[PDB]
User: Which sequence fits this backbone?
């Protein structure tokens, strides 16, 4: 149950600014290098697909991403356009745990209007501390690429 | 509410076969054209990514898709690799509703090991009968395909 990576890149549209900042702070307390990729908090309405690239281009075996829109659905659709990305909208620790175990998920999507910050913090901790199981999943994860 | 399309393509891996056949019969009873894209029920282990292509190839403004693996997580990742596809893993009618309203979702993913068939049928019904809201969502949905 140690941290699987210690670098995270986070973005949101306008709906996810508060959660994004709260989760960034948590991740700093945990000792991660944390990169904020916008949107600027002064923005009142932007389009979530415009805030995906700067996160997903940095995602790797040593760097994970967090994407936040109102529901999470749009961020997860957008992130998974990229073959090196494996993004899961998680509203529970169970879902985070399974996405990491089975799919080696490297982008965590949140719906800020439907999850409270304390629960999202738990979900992110599970995501960051769950190892990929490999084995029979390895071949499927390879194919996702 | 009115069904938004009357054509559905469905696929699964081995974990999803039973639910896939249950939801196909449901759709048929509802008067949909229903297209089974495997896997063969005789198959006891396959790879979910191999069963996405045949569904997403057929998805359009007139045709939706349903993808099923153990969790739904892998199918949603694999589905959203394609620019014409807007897939959502839904375990509740609320998420089905929101995915349609905001994202014009055209592929519904289920986790057969984590949803009971009767709840899955409600989720699918909601998905099929919820209109896209357009409005301020249209520009973002358009960007999803760019």
Assistant:
């Amino acid at each position: 149950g140690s941290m699987v990576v210690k670098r995270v890149f986070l973005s949101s549209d306008h709906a996810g600014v508060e959660l994004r900042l709260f989760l960034s702070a948590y991740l700093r307390d945990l000792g991660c290098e944390v990169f904020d990729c916008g949107c600027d908090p002064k923005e009142h309405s932007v389009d979530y697909p415009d805030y995906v690239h700067d996160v997903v281009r940095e995602v790797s075996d040593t760097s994970f991403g967090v994407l936040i829109c109102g529901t999470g659905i749009g961020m997860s659709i957008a992130a998974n356009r990229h073959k090196n990305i494996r993004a899961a909208l998680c509203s529970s620790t169970m879902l985070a745990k399974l996405s990491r175990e089975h799919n080696d998920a490297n982008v965590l999507c949140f719906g800020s209007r439907y999850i409270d910050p304390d629960t999202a913090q738990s979900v992110l901790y599970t995501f960051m501390t769950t190892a990929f199981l490999g084995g029979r999943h390895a071949v499927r994860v390879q194919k996702l690429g």
Summary: Chain B has one domain: 1-146. The longest helix of chain B spans residues 17-29. Residues 1-146 of chain B form a domain with the Ribose 5-phosphate Isomerase B; Chain: A, fold (CATH 3.40.1400.10).
